Design an enzyme around this catalytic site. Structure first.
Site, PDB file in Angstrom:
ATOM      1  N   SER B 149       1.222  -2.747  -3.903  1.00 28.92           N
ATOM      2  CA  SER B 149       1.998  -2.122  -2.619  1.00 28.92           C
ATOM      3  C   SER B 149       2.864  -1.104  -3.414  1.00 28.92           C
ATOM      4  O   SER B 149       2.957  -1.346  -4.465  1.00 28.92           O
ATOM      5  CB  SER B 149       2.858  -3.323  -2.188  1.00 28.92           C
ATOM      6  OG  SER B 149       3.763  -2.850  -1.233  1.00 28.92           O
ATOM      7  N   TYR B 162       7.825 -10.364  -4.197  1.00 28.96           N
ATOM      8  CA  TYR B 162       6.912  -9.704  -3.922  1.00 28.96           C
ATOM      9  C   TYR B 162       6.831  -8.244  -4.847  1.00 28.96           C
ATOM     10  O   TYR B 162       5.633  -7.695  -5.163  1.00 28.96           O
ATOM     11  CB  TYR B 162       6.746  -9.375  -2.515  1.00 28.96           C
ATOM     12  CG  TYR B 162       5.718  -8.479  -1.776  1.00 28.96           C
ATOM     13  CD1 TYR B 162       4.262  -9.186  -1.449  1.00 28.96           C
ATOM     14  CD2 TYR B 162       5.910  -7.151  -1.579  1.00 28.96           C
ATOM     15  CE1 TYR B 162       3.353  -8.319  -0.987  1.00 28.96           C
ATOM     16  CE2 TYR B 162       4.574  -6.334  -1.078  1.00 28.96           C
ATOM     17  CZ  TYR B 162       3.575  -6.920  -0.675  1.00 28.96           C
ATOM     18  OH  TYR B 162       2.651  -6.385  -0.053  1.00 28.96           O
TER      19      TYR B 162
HETATM   20  N1  LIG Z   1      -0.010  -4.950   5.455  1.00 32.05           N
HETATM   21  C1  LIG Z   1       0.363  -4.117   4.865  1.00 32.05           C
HETATM   22  O1  LIG Z   1       1.571  -3.429   5.290  1.00 32.05           O
HETATM   23  C2  LIG Z   1       0.270  -3.973   3.384  1.00 32.05           C
HETATM   24  C3  LIG Z   1      -0.188  -5.281   2.781  1.00 32.05           C
HETATM   25  N2  LIG Z   1      -0.590  -5.119   1.473  1.00 32.05           N
HETATM   26  C4  LIG Z   1      -1.265  -6.374   0.747  1.00 32.05           C
HETATM   27  O2  LIG Z   1      -2.559  -6.336   1.350  1.00 32.05           O
HETATM   28  C5  LIG Z   1      -3.067  -7.516   1.305  1.00 32.05           C
HETATM   29  C6  LIG Z   1      -3.388  -8.089   2.590  1.00 32.05           C
HETATM   30  O3  LIG Z   1      -2.217  -8.216   3.333  1.00 32.05           O
HETATM   31  P1  LIG Z   1      -2.196  -8.572   5.109  1.00 32.05           P
HETATM   32  O4  LIG Z   1      -3.640  -8.419   5.256  1.00 32.05           O
HETATM   33  O5  LIG Z   1      -1.315  -7.417   5.456  1.00 32.05           O
HETATM   34  O6  LIG Z   1      -1.877  -9.808   5.133  1.00 32.05           O
HETATM   35  P2  LIG Z   1      -2.157 -10.946   5.885  1.00 32.05           P
HETATM   36  O7  LIG Z   1      -0.906 -12.004   5.706  1.00 32.05           O
HETATM   37  O8  LIG Z   1      -2.477 -10.846   7.436  1.00 32.05           O
HETATM   38  O9  LIG Z   1      -3.389 -11.729   5.143  1.00 32.05           O
HETATM   39  C7  LIG Z   1      -3.315 -12.202   3.584  1.00 32.05           C
HETATM   40  C8  LIG Z   1      -4.224 -13.173   3.397  1.00 32.05           C
HETATM   41  O10 LIG Z   1      -4.038 -13.761   2.129  1.00 32.05           O
HETATM   42  C9  LIG Z   1      -4.267 -15.253   2.341  1.00 32.05           C
HETATM   43  N3  LIG Z   1      -3.403 -16.076   1.599  1.00 32.05           N
HETATM   44  C10 LIG Z   1      -2.167 -16.330   1.517  1.00 32.05           C
HETATM   45  N4  LIG Z   1      -1.691 -17.292   0.812  1.00 32.05           N
HETATM   46  C11 LIG Z   1      -2.778 -17.890   0.395  1.00 32.05           C
HETATM   47  C12 LIG Z   1      -3.021 -18.995  -0.313  1.00 32.05           C
HETATM   48  N5  LIG Z   1      -2.070 -19.675  -0.909  1.00 32.05           N
HETATM   49  N6  LIG Z   1      -4.474 -19.290  -0.736  1.00 32.05           N
HETATM   50  C13 LIG Z   1      -5.503 -18.432  -0.237  1.00 32.05           C
HETATM   51  N7  LIG Z   1      -5.235 -17.475   0.724  1.00 32.05           N
HETATM   52  C14 LIG Z   1      -3.889 -16.939   0.849  1.00 32.05           C
HETATM   53  C15 LIG Z   1      -4.135 -15.395   3.907  1.00 32.05           C
HETATM   54  O11 LIG Z   1      -4.912 -16.547   4.340  1.00 32.05           O
HETATM   55  P3  LIG Z   1      -4.588 -17.148   5.964  1.00 32.05           P
HETATM   56  O12 LIG Z   1      -4.485 -16.302   6.973  1.00 32.05           O
HETATM   57  O13 LIG Z   1      -5.873 -18.124   6.012  1.00 32.05           O
HETATM   58  O14 LIG Z   1      -3.481 -18.078   5.757  1.00 32.05           O
HETATM   59  C16 LIG Z   1      -4.645 -14.228   4.383  1.00 32.05           C
HETATM   60  O15 LIG Z   1      -6.087 -14.175   4.669  1.00 32.05           O
HETATM   61  C17 LIG Z   1      -2.008  -8.590   0.789  1.00 32.05           C
HETATM   62  O16 LIG Z   1      -2.352  -8.535  -0.537  1.00 32.05           O
HETATM   63  C18 LIG Z   1      -0.638  -7.579   0.847  1.00 32.05           C
HETATM   64  O17 LIG Z   1       0.045  -7.841  -0.382  1.00 32.05           O
HETATM   65  C19 LIG Z   1       0.403  -4.359   0.600  1.00 32.05           C
HETATM   66  C20 LIG Z   1       0.938  -3.356   1.111  1.00 32.05           C
HETATM   67  C21 LIG Z   1       1.116  -3.217   2.583  1.00 32.05           C
END
Ligand SMILES: NC(=O)C1=CN([C@@H]2O[C@H](COP(=O)(O)OP(=O)(O)OC[C@H]3O[C@@H](n4cnc5c(N)ncnc54)[C@H](OP(=O)(O)O)[C@@H]3O)[C@@H](O)[C@H]2O)C=CC1
Ligand SMILES: NC(=O)C1=CN([C@@H]2O[C@H](COP(=O)(O)OP(=O)(O)OC[C@H]3O[C@@H](n4cnc5c(N)ncnc54)[C@H](OP(=O)(O)O)[C@@H]3O)[C@@H](O)[C@H]2O)C=CC1
EC number: 1.-.-.-
Lengths: 240, 242
Positions: B149, B162
């Site tokens: 990020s 984070y």
């Molecule tokens: N969205 C944004 O504006 C941006 C996103 N990011 C990064 O992009 C990536 C995707 O994020 P985004 O798609 O936005 O987020 P989402 O929250 O929508 O999805 C995150 C994913 O990580 C999984 N997850 C969280 N905790 C666990 C765990 N303990 N064990 C296994 N899986 C886990 C979730 O699973 P589940 O749904 O099944 O619980 C989900 O599939 C993340 O790494 C985030 O840090 C970085 C900057 C910006």
């Protein structure tokens, strides 16, 4: 830097039991500071305390906090015991740190790895959180993190140490941004220094060809003293 | 950028496959010929994504459960053995999974939430990377991608665990990048603000229709798993330059 630079400044130092932290203490003390010592070894801290006493004439307090096992409650409790005796903190040097495994990512042990982020990031996060009220009660509070050059640019084999110095640097930058014009918040990169952490890392390196913690102190004093008041959110190299 | 046979017969594992940006990468990779492995922690969410990618491609992915908050080094080694059985390599790994935690003054950050974030984002991702590096080594040009990020490059107010975790992520990547020069591609993606639920949690007031969607930002995601990026490593790339 004049010998009374830190007169009536209250400065807490972690890893005061050995190495850089040991030297920072003794020195801040020689510059007139009320130093506070933190470590996990009562017997070692007593000796540091003793030596500072023989040096400067004042017997500095030490408090015990093992950073591997310590909780938020213990840290918050430690804040409590410090408020008992001191109205404020003017400086906090987070110097304690665990090197862990120096080997390829494939070899790195996962418990040593979770020990490294515990001591270098979490426990340091937690303990900072507890000491911020005392730092704010100072006229110009100075919080300092210790980084390393693998905290700026990951090289091979540094593993858990490195990830955790990166985190130290971002943690520093979040904090500095939150305490703009309230606190100084910085990092020092000491660079290689005559300690037993450095030697673990570099078995072959000749330590006598390294600067001692003593030699690298000008920066440690500058960041606690009045000439850095205007500086925050930066990482200084003790050896550029 | 690309073309629709690009990822043909490349084998790519995607964590956080069950929603947001990983769901879309998994879906997207598969439409460009990839054989995808979906990882997440929610069976039903995962069942659904697999089914959806089937009906779109006619190849149904396999999905696996790893709770990156609770996993042990063993749990990940097992998984990797499980993968190694049906699979002859990994041409690619997208570590997408992430935990936001508390957005608030460092004075207010919960210590347990702080530790949960570093565990998902740094330690489990560490342990997981470690368990899969052998299979990746078996590719001719394997690709390891982390997700950062912009606060993994520059900490800002209120990002707490984070921001700390994402610096530790850029850091981690650079190490790996250093050790596998000419062996693996090891890079980071900065997605930018993307229309997902994590984003919404952080910017509740934000109008999500003003953001790009996961699918708007997929070029980069695609660029890095294929041959057009073969000699590039050790770098963080922005899906949205700006
Ligand atoms: N969205 C944004 O504006 C941006 C996103 N990011 C990064 O992009 C990536 C995707 O994020 P985004 O798609 O936005 O987020 P989402 O929250 O929508 O999805 C995150 C994913 O990580 C999984 N997850 C969280 N905790 C666990 C765990 N303990 N064990 C296994 N899986 C886990 C979730 O699973 P589940 O749904 O099944 O619980 C989900 O599939 C993340 O790494 C985030 O840090 C970085 C900057 C910006
Ligand atoms: N020396 C060098 O070349 C470099 C050092 N650094 C950093 O400088 C700082 C000081 O390191 P240095 O003086 O070299 O190393 P040392 O290992 O000699 O001393 C480190 C200090 O940290 C304390 N410590 C370690 N773990 C714990 C714990 N769990 N609880 C409480 N205290 C703990 C130690 O206590 P004790 O040993 O008494 O038990 C010791 O007081 C660290 O942040 C290090 O990472 C950065 C770059 C280079």
């Amino acid at each position: 830097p004049k010998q009374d630079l830190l007169n009536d400044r209250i400065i807490l130092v972690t890893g005061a039991s050995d190495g850089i932290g040991r030297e920072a203490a003794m020195t801040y003390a020689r510059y007139g500071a009320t130093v506070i010592l933190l470590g996990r070894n009562e017997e070692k801290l007593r000796q540091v305390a003793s030596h500072i006493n023989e040096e400067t004439g004042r017997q500095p307090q030490w408090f015990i906090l093992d950073l591997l096992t310590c909780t938020s409650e213990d840290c918050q409790q430690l804040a409590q015991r410090i408020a008992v005796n001191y109205p404020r903190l003017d400086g906090v040097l987070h110097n304690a740190g665990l090197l862990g495994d120096v080997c390829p990512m494939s070899e790195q042990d996962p418990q040593v790895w979770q020990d490294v982020m515990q001591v270098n990031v979490n426990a340091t996060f937690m303990l900072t959180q507890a000491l911020l009220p005392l730092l704010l009660k100072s006229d110009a509070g100075s919080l300092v993190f210790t980084s390393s050059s693998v905290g700026r640019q990951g090289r091979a084999n540094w593993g858990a140490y490195a990830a955790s110095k990166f985190a130290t640097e971002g943690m520093m930058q979040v904090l500095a941004d939150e305490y703009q014009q309230r606190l100084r918040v910085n990092c020092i990169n000491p660079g290689g220094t005559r300690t037993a952490m450095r030697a673990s890392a570099f078995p072959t390196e000749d330590p006598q060809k390294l600067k001692t913690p003593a030699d690298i102190m000008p920066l440690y004093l500058w960041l606690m003293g009045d000439d850095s008041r205007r500086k925050t959110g930066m990482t200084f190299d003790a050896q550029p």
